[PDB]
Amino acid sequence: AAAQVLSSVESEIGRTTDPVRMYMREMGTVELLTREGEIDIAKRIEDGINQVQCSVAEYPEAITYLLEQYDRVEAEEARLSDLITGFVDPNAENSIDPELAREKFAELRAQYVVTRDTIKAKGRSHATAQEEILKLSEVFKQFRLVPKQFDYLVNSMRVMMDRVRTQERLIMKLCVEQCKMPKKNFITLFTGNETSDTWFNAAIAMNKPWSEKLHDVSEEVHRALQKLQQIEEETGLTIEQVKDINRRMSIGEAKARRAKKEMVEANLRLVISIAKKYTRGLQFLDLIQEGN
Amino acid sequence: ETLRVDPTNDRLSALVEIYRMMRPGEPPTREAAESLFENLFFSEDRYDLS
Amino acid sequence: VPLDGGRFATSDLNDLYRRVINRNNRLKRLLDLAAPDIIVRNEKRMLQEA
């Protein structure tokens, strides 16, 4: 309990105005880890990174984006742009050679052409379709892309979820706060089909005098429905699948951030021990921030 | 009278109070207090009467 | 302004402005880095002090 003495010291300070000693008091609470903390933290960071990689593999057009810029630069007879560095670069457990890129993309094309018809067979939830999608995600997993392209790859999911969630909360922004339909039945009816107006006119079938006056707001409550239909038809994924994908991306990223954050303060002492030698050109506390 | 006003009771408390007076804000430590007190008047490098 | 011997002279306001905008840029960079809250707090306090 290193925070117990913090109460006994801060409540009885001389009100020090020196930012350096208060910063060192703040960073002195964390202790040093050795030979076990680094390994466990690195394992947690890798688990978070692999969870993030898993999240983007399920999204159907991630493969299409992995492939289409390389297809575009194929027609140039060469790939001299920096995106050749942002190739798949499969991990092994150097310059990009055609003998590797074409070999890796052959099975990618095969999966891209073989995973379409199986989805239509016995619906999206087909066992063989699901396992083939998982296999395609796995063969996508054997790649090690660059963080530059990976950044916008995950930004695509962030923006797509932002758009879909804005279209979602638009429903409460237009009707729940004004018409006041109970959410207890609304949450169950929304997940029913989310493709047609079966529950929209099922509410009309019930008494629901508030819902009876929906025609005046029909031409603005059905626009969100049409937008979410458009999102589904352009992404090729159901609402539940993307909610699961991003709800696990969220906690994978949270775990990675927590691991990196917890690792960081374990070496603030090292940062100070290095920064003290470099003063005096500029300052003493700015060097600490640069070391951080 | 000075003992009456004194709030401390042993050497450790006195060293902690000296450290708190000299370096407010920084939490006292078992060894830092004695190191600072020794360096105040009992180190040749950091003290000299000539 | 330049001096005769090829030197320069400036008011301390240039130093203070350089310090405050250096720390402001560092804070702006830290915010988009999702840095740990203690480092962001330290940088905000440093900006306040500057």
UniProtKB/Swiss-Prot annotation, chain A:
Species this protein is from: Escherichia coli (strain K12)
User: What does the entry's free-text domain comment contain?
Assistant: Contains 4 domains, connected by flexible linkers. In the active conformation, the domains are in an extended conformation, each making extensive interactions with the RNA polymerase catalytic core.
Put simply, this protein is called RNA polymerase sigma factor RpoD
Subcellular location per the Swiss-Prot or TrEMBL entry: Cytoplasm
Q: Where is this motif: Interaction with polymerase core subunit RpoC?
A: 286-289
Subunit and interaction comment = Interacts transiently with the RNA polymerase catalytic core formed by RpoA, RpoB, RpoC and RpoZ (2 alpha, 1 beta, 1 beta' and 1 omega subunit) to form the RNA polymerase holoenzyme that can initiate transcription. Identified in a complex containing RpoD, the RNA polymerase subunits RpoA, RpoB and RpoZ, CRP and DNA. Interacts with Rsd; this prevents interaction with the RNA polymerase catalytic core and with promoter DNA, and as a consequence, promotes transcription from promoters that require alternative sigma factors. (Microbial infection) Interacts with Escherichia phage lambda antitermination protein Q.
Family, per the entry?
A: Belongs to the sigma-70 factor family. RpoD/SigA subfamily.
Superkingdom of the organism of origin: Bacteria
Q: Summarize the protein's role.
A: Sigma factors are initiation factors that promote the attachment of RNA polymerase to specific initiation sites and are then released. This sigma factor is the primary sigma factor during exponential growth. Preferentially transcribes genes associated with fast growth, such as ribosomal operons, other protein-synthesis related genes, rRNA- and tRNA-encoding genes and prfB.
UniProtKB/Swiss-Prot annotation, chain B:
Highest rank taxon of the organism: Bacteria
Describe the practical uses of this protein.
Co-administration of salinamide and rifampicin or salinamide and myxopyronin suppresses the emergence of resistance to both antibiotics.
Q: What PTM annotation applies here?
A: Acetylated on several lysine residues in the presence of glucose.
* Entry function: DNA-dependent RNA polymerase (RNAP) catalyzes the transcription of DNA into RNA using the four ribonucleoside triphosphates as substrates.
Instruction: Spell out the subunit comment.
Output: The RNAP catalytic core consists of 2 alpha, 1 beta, 1 beta' and 1 omega subunit. When a sigma factor is associated with the core the holoenzyme is formed, which can initiate transcription. The rRNA transcription and antitermination complex (rrnTAC) consists of RNAP, NusA, NusB, NusE (rpsJ), NusG, SubB, ribosomal protein S4, DNA and precursor rRNA; S4 is more flexible than other subunits. In pull-down experiments interacts with CedA.
**Family the UniProt entry places it in:** Belongs to the RNA polymerase beta chain family.
Q: What is this protein called?
A: DNA-directed RNA polymerase subunit beta
The species this protein belongs to is Escherichia coli (strain K12)
Source lineage: Bacteria, Pseudomonadati, Pseudomonadota, Gammaproteobacteria, Enterobacterales
List the range of the whole protein covered here.
349 to 398 of 1342
Swiss-Prot record, chain C:
Its domain of life reads: Bacteria
* Applications reported: Co-administration of salinamide and rifampicin or salinamide and myxopyronin suppresses the emergence of resistance to both antibiotics.
The residue stretches assigned to a coiled coil in this entry are none
- PTM statement from Swiss-Prot or TrEMBL: Acetylated on several lysine residues in the presence of glucose.
Oligomer and partners: The RNAP catalytic core consists of 2 alpha, 1 beta, 1 beta' and 1 omega subunit. When a sigma factor is associated with the core the holoenzyme is formed, which can initiate transcription. The rRNA transcription and antitermination complex (rrnTAC) consists of RNAP, NusA, NusB, NusE (rpsJ), NusG, SubB, ribosomal protein S4, DNA and precursor rRNA; S4 is more flexible than other subunits.
The similarity comment for this entry is:
Belongs to the RNA polymerase beta' chain family.
Q: What job does this protein perform? A: DNA-dependent RNA polymerase (RNAP) catalyzes the transcription of DNA into RNA using the four ribonucleoside triphosphates as substrates.
**Name of protein:** DNA-directed RNA polymerase subunit beta'
Q: Which gene encodes it?
A: rpoC
